[PDB]
């Protein structure tokens, strides 16, 4: 389909859930990244897919799903220049239940102040997933994320 999505999940204290992909992920194992990313399955809405993957990867319920970067596209090229292009709209959401993280999906995670995370994405972007860096680097999306919890 070439359809993907990304989710930045916040708690009631306004902290962002930064996750570390498990070592068993085929793609980007062991990398620190925004809360959840994924792809919708057959005849599933983007929203539905986000809810499904938050529940499966993080064991969590969410609310207030809000678009923060609808035009984001993720372009990846391999060492031979084979290109993969996919739309990847970005959303923010609020956690409404305690985490029950699936260790096959996520090996570590931290609730962190978004301002602090951005400091590191600027200083050492290579320590995080490339889509996390590219999503937060858009000024409008970053403003939306910084202000999401305060509405």
From Swiss-Prot:
Compartment annotation: Cytoplasm
Binding-site positions, Mg(2+): 37, 57
GO BP terms in the entry: dimethylallyl diphosphate biosynthetic process; isoprenoid biosynthetic process
Keywords: Cytoplasm, Isomerase, Isoprene biosynthesis, Magnesium, Manganese, Metal-binding
Record flagged with keyword Metal-binding: yes
Active-site positions on this chain: 37, 86
Residues the record lists as binding Mn(2+): 2, 39, 84, 86
Residues in Nudix hydrolase domain copies: 1-134
Record-level Gene Ontology MF annotations: isopentenyl-diphosphate delta-isomerase activity; metal ion binding
Cofactor requirement: Mg(2+); Mn(2+)
GO CC term (a single one): cytoplasm
Domain of life per record: Bacteria
Keyword Transferase attached: no
Biochemical pathway: Isoprenoid biosynthesis; dimethylallyl diphosphate biosynthesis; dimethylallyl diphosphate from isopentenyl diphosphate: step 1/1
EC number(s) stated in the UniProt entry for this protein: 5.3.3.2
Reaction it catalyzes: isopentenyl diphosphate = dimethylallyl diphosphate
Co-factor binding details: Binds 1 Mg(2+) ion per subunit. The magnesium ion binds only when substrate is bound. Binds 1 Mn(2+) ion per subunit.
Membrane spanning residue stretches: none
Major subcellular location class: cytoplasm
Complex formation: Homodimer.
Function of the molecule: Catalyzes the 1,3-allylic rearrangement of the homoallylic substrate isopentenyl (IPP) to its highly electrophilic allylic isomer, dimethylallyl diphosphate (DMAPP).
Family according to the record: Belongs to the IPP isomerase type 1 family.
Protein name in the entry: Isopentenyl-diphosphate Delta-isomerase
Naturally occurring in which organism (per UniProt): Salmonella typhimurium (strain LT2 / SGSC1412 / ATCC 700720)
Gene: idi
Residues of the full protein shown: 31 to 181 of 181
């Amino acid at each position: 389909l070439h359809l993907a999505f990304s989710c930045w999940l916040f708690n009631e204290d306004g902290q962002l859930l930064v996750t570390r992909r498990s070592l068993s992920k085929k793609a980007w194992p062991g990398v620190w990244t925004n809360s959840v990313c994924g792809h919708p399955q057959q005849g599933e809405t983007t929203e539905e897919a986000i809810i499904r993957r938050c529940r499966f990867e993080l064991g969590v319920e969410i609310t207030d799903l809000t678009p923060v970067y609808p035009h984001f596209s993720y372009r990846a090229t391999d060492p031979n220049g084979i290109v993969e292009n996919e739309v990847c709209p970005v959303f923010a959401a609020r956690a409404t239940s305690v985490l029950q993280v699936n260790s096959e999906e996520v090996m570590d995670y931290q609730w962190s102040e978004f301002k602090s995370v951005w400091k590191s994405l600027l200083a050492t972007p290579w320590a995080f997933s490339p889509w996390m860096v590219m999503q937060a680097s858009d000024e409008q999306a970053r403003e939306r994320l910084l202000n999401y919890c305060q509405r």
